[PDB]
Design a protein around this ligand. Sequence first.
Ligand SMILES: Nc1nc(NC2CC2)cc(-c2cccc(Cl)c2Cl)n1
Length: 154
Amino acid sequence: STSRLYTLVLVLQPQRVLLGMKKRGFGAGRWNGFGGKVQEGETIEDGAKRELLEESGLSVDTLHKVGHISFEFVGSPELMDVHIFSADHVHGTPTESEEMRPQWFQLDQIPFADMWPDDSYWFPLLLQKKKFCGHFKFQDQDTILSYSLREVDS
Ligand SMILES: Nc1nc(NC2CC2)cc(-c2cccc(Cl)c2Cl)n1
């Protein structure tokens, strides 16, 4: 049983981060970066850009490679293969979409309590400008059974 490709784009700036409140579907009622499924016929980076445009209304020329996290759940055959990107520069205005309502948070005021539990572990690596690689086994949606997390030169 193989995995499916996901992207996650974190809109960063010197003092703040633009998260998105998920309004519907998987992760509804939680703050997260912008992203979703990688389709057939686009590269992973194209998918990241697309989902950022569609969910926030923002454009980019380029993204940074910051993380590669593989998620799995107990009693589930399908794995999430997440390619995490930072967008430290953006064009346009943040606009509320059907799927996401964007909001700015200062980097010392990130609402980890209402984000996915894994974010508390890998966000510090992102904010130190470290590239990271890891696996997370979830018991349920609020409970990490086991996890592995390391930095990489890549
Ligand atoms: N921060 C974070 N954490 C996650 N933790 C995994 C237990 C669910 C999953 C995701 C994610 C990334 C891209 C697309 C989608 Cl649908 C999701 Cl849910 N993001």
